Design a binder for this molecule. Sequence first.
Ligand SMILES: *C(=O)N1C[C@H](NOS(=O)(=O)O)CC[C@H]1C(=O)NNC(C)=O
Ligand SMILES: *C(=O)N1C[C@H](NOS(=O)(=O)O)CC[C@H]1C(=O)NNC(C)=O
Ligand SMILES: [Cl-]
Ligand SMILES: [Co+2]
Ligand SMILES: [Co+2]
Ligand SMILES: [Co+2]
Ligand SMILES: [Co+2]
Ligand SMILES: [Co+2]
Ligand SMILES: [Co+2]
Lengths: 242, 241
Amino acid sequence: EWQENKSWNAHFTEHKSQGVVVLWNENKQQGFTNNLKRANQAFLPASTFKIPNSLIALDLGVVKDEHQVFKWDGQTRDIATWNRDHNLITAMKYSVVPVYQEFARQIGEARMSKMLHAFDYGNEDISGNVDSFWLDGGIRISATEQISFLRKLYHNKLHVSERSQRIVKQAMLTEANGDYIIRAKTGYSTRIEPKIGWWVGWVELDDNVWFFAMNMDMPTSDGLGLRQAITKEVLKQEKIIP
Amino acid sequence: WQENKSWNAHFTEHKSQGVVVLWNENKQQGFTNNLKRANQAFLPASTFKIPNSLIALDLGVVKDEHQVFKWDGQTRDIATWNRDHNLITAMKYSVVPVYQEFARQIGEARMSKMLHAFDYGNEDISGNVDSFWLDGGIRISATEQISFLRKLYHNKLHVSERSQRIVKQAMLTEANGDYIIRAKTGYSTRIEPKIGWWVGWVELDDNVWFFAMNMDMPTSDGLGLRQAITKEVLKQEKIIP
Ligand SMILES: *C(=O)N1C[C@H](NOS(=O)(=O)O)CC[C@H]1C(=O)NNC(C)=O
Ligand SMILES: *C(=O)N1C[C@H](NOS(=O)(=O)O)CC[C@H]1C(=O)NNC(C)=O
Ligand SMILES: [Cl-]
Ligand SMILES: [Co+2]
Ligand SMILES: [Co+2]
Ligand SMILES: [Co+2]
Ligand SMILES: [Co+2]
Ligand SMILES: [Co+2]
Ligand SMILES: [Co+2]
């Protein structure tokens, strides 16, 4: 169940932006969003797919652990932080697509599909290239479906080892201080219209957890910081964070 | 351990005495402002919550980081203690009575065996089974803390990998786009000298720096200096911005 709260639209409008934030209060089992229809609109996950891809790679032993080093392939790419060696922690942090494309190739289509059905991940459709389907293939997931997935991960309820789930949650770590912890992943779907930015994850408090999933129209990269900025304004409006 | 006395400026600054120890994991090199004090062994006090958590999890005394340990209804001086807690919050607010109950359930024999496996300090649990790390015979130095923490970091202690991952989760203190700090504070008051502790590590993209500091702490007023002085050292060494 999602209650609509259109007052959050002011934070989009303020920033000349259009999109949706979806929040889920774990203790109360209640959801909230500014736009019910867009909350259920499915889009390409793009880099947010690094969450399930990580889980599958670890569960299958494609990735041994979070210290294993994936050597740069020597190809210079546009994002400078990609042109160096990575481990799982840094490949998540810097959203290093070619590292995850190598995982996908090794996982292979059969296991990939089986896993995404186990996860109930969006439309469970991996059609397209095994190495890019989540960037330009047939898979789609909505913000509310992201939340349903993330809740399973939070509770170690996905059909992969507990260990895999704990390592991915570690790798998702974004921010922590004395008030909250955020575990999350950004994304930016550019290859297929509409261009959209994602931020999905959760906020751990002492006594509750708030799951979130947002997406917004993103015609250029110059708005990418608004993913987190708008989300955090919403969280502050709702007194989830100071 | 190389000595770097220039870090004394940060203690002098704040009218303070103590020691910071750093270990550069990639280079396998350590640095401290005071070699003697780096190796002086003190009561661990609340820093004992690290091994105590590991042992409680490995033995199933704590099932997971969500299990709730209900307040025993006794009002204590630290308000945050007077409420239900889980492992995460018990660590955050350094809730001694929760960890005293763990220690009773663990028991003397298993606690001793585990502290030998960990090579923890002088491996001596003499005193009350639920207070020996506050006012019994156990002693650990800043350099011994680092040896212990390295083993934890690398999942090399003799408890399950899962126990180690959980405790490192529960140690999470600060994270941002520059670093992650996993650490535990302490304040040893019950038996002189009164000293504050901070032990842990800083994770970077490409290295880890382990730390352990202790300082004289005649009152609770100066407790913020544990982190503040450590961070001045880290900043001077270009480990954090
Ligand atoms: C993920 O959506 N990626 C990889 C990288 N992610 O950064 S994000 O997590 O801050 O959004 C850059 C955007 C996106 C991607 O690969 N974009 N380009 C292509 C050709 O798909
Ligand atoms: C730990 O050394 N404790 C518990 C609590 N710790 O907070 S800290 O981690 O900021 O240091 C307060 C101090 C200390 C302790 O229990 N002190 N007093 C007594 C009577 O044991
Ligand atoms: Cl963590
Ligand atoms: Co606003
Ligand atoms: Co299905
Ligand atoms: Co749970
Ligand atoms: Co200074
Ligand atoms: Co012995
Ligand atoms: Co001995």
